[PDB]
Ligand binder design. Structure first.
Ligand code: NI
Ligand code: NI
Ligand code: NI
Lengths: 473, 466, 458
């Protein structure tokens, strides 16, 4: 398990220094800052103390730390045989930072930011690319690969592109490798299913993935040990935070949530069964009954419930995940384990899914959330419609605008609104393929890539604002 | 005048009792409540004490009552010869409730909500319908009957659909018959009395109560609506500052002069007052009144002039009682070229010249056109869905499409369930695809026309995300 | 000379001066001038208080134009009689001043993007709309292709002629109108331009002496005013602008070269240093003093150059055949004019607040045209009824028509009454499109935003 390098795209103690630099580099990065202004479930404009993408990530970060520490206590002396000796901090820092940036890629407005982009390109890309690369001329395999690549947007892939090629953070390949939750390319279609279901990286980062797989020591089409821990971390804190916000927002009552938890639990298992990992041998209904009994703390009745519920129930989940990592140590180190550590049908498995099940019935169906999903759908599409004039330009006109040359006055205004990082990332990519025979295909591919970087990098209010301004209303 | 209700599968006190339930059902219904939030002429958002659809319906309700009172007073003992034995409350209540709901069907924003709907379907229904039932399959006559059906929306027809098939109020067929002001249906080519979807209900109504004729209640309600059609709006104009009391009089006299001579006495006035004598009498009461000159003008003008109009409308009903009882009279009770006809038209003409053309009013009409059409454009993704896919969403099943799913979850439960029930009737029908999309479009017209002004503006604004 | 007193509804000189003085009143009291106060020049008026508007820009150009004319007669002196500009000091002054004041009444709101938005809209959708009115075959093809480029190429100067003459009906002298022929006109004003050239004795395709003077006026105060607004807004500093002015001036000529027309023989670097020195020494209004001291030293040579160029090319100018602007000759004062333009392009017009207003104004004008496009799709019979107020079967367009200004509708009715012509159908749709361009281009900034917002119903 010594697949831990310190090499950047540009003695264990030296690695720890480099991994410490990654910690400061990530926390100070703009990718983390955007997470505070992106809503998680309930829209931030209407809710005061509600979880954001950053505060969600911080919980996952500590939960991720809780797993790694609990993990090594279990391994004890045998960790040295596998190679985990003296990797307590390094694996800690890898898991900790990976959790924090687990969501830097994904766009505003939940998954409907994702849907809006793919839907727009699904509808208008084919006609747009046809004008840029006429049918017949141009390499057909790369074309069909570029077409499906742009049509399949995924946050995890953008997160790699964001840290590597847009924010140019130049983190160690080991730290970046945590973001490879999915391993399939977006050029390859959806089917080995679970670890290749969603796009893992973009075509623009294929060369970087080649360097990452070589430098960090892995096989193509495989994951990384940190990603399993991060996936389990997000699974554990997937909704418990969101459910607490719902109770505070008034959607359900604590007493009603308890029986609601019990009734929704019946699908997975029986509540009267004992829970693994609890010293006091508490059952799920006994834990829920224990949590409700402790509430009614006289200051924070709601807060105490989720606190008492967390101490009792987060411990088995964290303990479960650690045993799963050690049980499949060989499968994980190869990168060939094809399921999430949590997902195995066990009694603690029911914990994670019961939270998922309760949220879908009562939290995400709330009109305030679905109104934001629908509204963000318009904003992303309108933005794409607003900046589509840049896509209709032929490559000579656009590159002049991207370079600052005076062309075409309306598109020039659109170009001047784009972030410099995104224009320059476009310019730098084009400098690389400026002599390629297939430049026309890569130009428009990177043009759309630039336009897709723009919209997903927005915060909620940053996106709505730009939409409103262009609307001139 | 029967007492059968549509959910009734089976004595004047028995008939009068059932009609009393119709009063409670109508007054408490949401159809009435929306009328308070639908503007009549001047937009409610910008005007406080201005008449809305509900306050208009209330005024019309009383005028309709005053006719039945005058009708029985004029006919007197002769009522037995015609057959109006013991019908004081029933005809009073029938006319009263029919007037209250005379305007519930039509969408927000005056007629431009209607125009917006017809214009939207006229423009893009055909291409939308072609995808649903490909060329070849399906009765083409039924299709051509459905196209103009969906393309010809009329408020009165939707009023039939709303109380019967949307609010499920289950009113007596007689009370609903008041809503059949005009005769033509929507498949035959003026405004439709009913839509193709309500033919089965109309079939039961025509039998229980000849096909293609108007019920006696509608003529009184038609006359009721005409009397208070515009006099109310003019008062709002004077209050809005568009007209002055002295200025309005000269307009009333001048516009009346074209139709008849102002100095001619009006039939039905005990003092044999003419239009000029009445208007000079009403204006004289103004400037004599020292607290509320505007109010005094229209009350005096109402008191002197409403009574002859009511007498005339009742007199024409009895004059053509046989033609009315048949239902074959092809004109409104008021319109005959007489002196009171000139009164009604003088109010309408003054209104068209100064009130309905007001920029505040026409902006709202223009704005309501945009709102209704945008709302139809916003929910058109549901129309593009194939018939199988929609049913999953309407049933609450988890369909692949998340964006149409969000659109369906915004729709009222009543309209979705009414759609689901419509498909249950033609479940394994041979031509169900033609009917499925027909009820799909039908549901969307229920949604937009059921909105209030602000409900529409809000939903338009919300989906726009601006 | 080229100066008559005839209005559309050798001579006593005082009669012209009275008539031209009446033209002054007609212009100042006109709505065309009033709209200029509510149309932003560079920085959006909604967000900036003491920023120049089209009216405040035009007022400076008026003074600069006056200073040119005043300086011009001093140079000519007794030789002024030889050319025929004898005793025309007041008349040519007042003529030039008003030409400056209305030099910008034509162009639409939102900078050049109001112009750009209209042409872009007509270039995209004019063809299909016109074809419905004139199917292939029928209609003069020469006139059709000529009407197309006329409608597709909107220009403020052309609209300025049309507005005062055919829309506001000011009935100004042809000489006052002749100043607006900087470039140049619509097909709708060909007959009016022909009478103007005949009345003034102009061969076709030539300029007017006032236009050369006005152009020099606009060139001189083109940008120095906008630059001062930037300093107040914080875009630039006084010290930063000075090094920028000298550095950007270096491309054209050498800064230490002396500037013609300065009694003290000052160079560009010396003038900027003189202006900067008076500032910071001035203790209350450093910004104003900089531009006052700068204007004092630098406007005087510019005006002298334009007057001197006028007499140098008097023969070409009175002919109307001079094919360059008085300012642009590669000289030292020309380098002054370009230095201001150069510095402005780098720091002023490129400002995001400005470009947002342009992008938004591009949106508003295009949306407004889309909103009123239903009027273009109507056939001529429907519209003529709508313009006359008769109750036509159409319900939505009648609301749209009732929103249009009466002057623009009445101007259309009068044009159609003029043309029954065999190609009336060809002229009807051209004048229909023209009225829509009159509507949109006549709006102020906020008037355009408001109508757009209202129709959007949001
Ligand atoms: Ni997460
Ligand atoms: Ni009515
Ligand atoms: Ni200018």
């Amino acid at each position: 398990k010594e697949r831990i390098s310190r090499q950047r795209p540009h003695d264990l103690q030296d690695i720890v220094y480099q991994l410490e630099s990654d910690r400061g580099r990530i926390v100070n990065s703009a990718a983390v800052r955007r997470l505070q202004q992106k809503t998680q479930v309930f829209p931030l404009e209407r809710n005061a103390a509600v979880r954001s993408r950053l505060t969600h990530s911080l919980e996952v970060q500590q939960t991720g730390r809780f797993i790694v520490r609990t993990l090594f206590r279990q391994l004890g002396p045998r960790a040295a045989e596998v190679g985990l000796d003296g990797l307590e901090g390094a694996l800690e820092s890898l898991v900790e930072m990976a959790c924090l940036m687990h969501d830097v890629g994904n766009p505003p407005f939940g998954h409907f930011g994702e849907y809006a982009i793919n839907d727009w390109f699904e509808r208008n890309l084919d006609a747009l690319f046809e004008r840029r690369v006429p049918p017949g001329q141009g390499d057909g395999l790369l074309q069909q690969r570029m077409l499906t690549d742009l049509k399949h947007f995924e946050g995890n892939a953008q997160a790699i592109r964001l840290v590597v090629k847009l924010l140019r953070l130049n983190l160690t390949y080991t730290q970046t490798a945590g973001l490879l939750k999915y391993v399939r390319p977006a050029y390859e279609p959806k089917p080995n299913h679970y670890l290749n279901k969603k796009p893992g990286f973009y075509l623009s980062e294929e060369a970087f993935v080649d360097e990452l797989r070589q430098v960090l020591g892995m096989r193509p089409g495989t994951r990384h040990p940190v990603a399993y821990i991060m996936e389990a971390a997000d699974d554990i804190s997937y909704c418990l935070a969101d459910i607490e916000d719902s109770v505070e927002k008034g959607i359900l009552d604590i007493r009603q949530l308890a029986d609601l938890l019990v009734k929704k639990f019946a699908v997975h298992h029986s509540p009267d069964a004992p829970i693994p990992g609890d010293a006091d041998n508490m059952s799920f209904q006994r834990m829920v009954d224990y949590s409700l009994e402790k509430a009614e703390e006289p200051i924070n009745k709601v807060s105490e419930f989720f606190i008492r519920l967390r101490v009792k129930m987060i411990h088995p989940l964290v303990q479960h995940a650690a045993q799963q990592f050690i049980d499949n140590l060989e499968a994980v180190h190869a990168g060939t384990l094809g399921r999430a550590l949590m997902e195995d049908g066990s009694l603690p498995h029911a914990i994670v899914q019961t939270f998922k099940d309760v949220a879908m019935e009562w939290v995400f169906c709330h009109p305030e959330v679905e109104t934001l999903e629908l509204q963000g759908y318009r904003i992303i599409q309108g933005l794409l419609d607003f900046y589509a004039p840049l896509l209709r330009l032929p490559a000579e006109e656009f590159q002049a605008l991207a370079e600052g040359r005076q062309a075409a006055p309306h598109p020039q205004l659109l170009v001047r609104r784009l972030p410099s990082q995104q224009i320059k990332a476009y310019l730098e990519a084009m400098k690389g393929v400026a002599e390629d025979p297939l430049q026309r295909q890569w130009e428009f591919y990177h043009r759309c890539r630039m336009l897709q970087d723009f919209v997903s990098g927005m915060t909620d209010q940053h996106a709505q604002d730009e939409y409103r301004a262009l609307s001139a209303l």
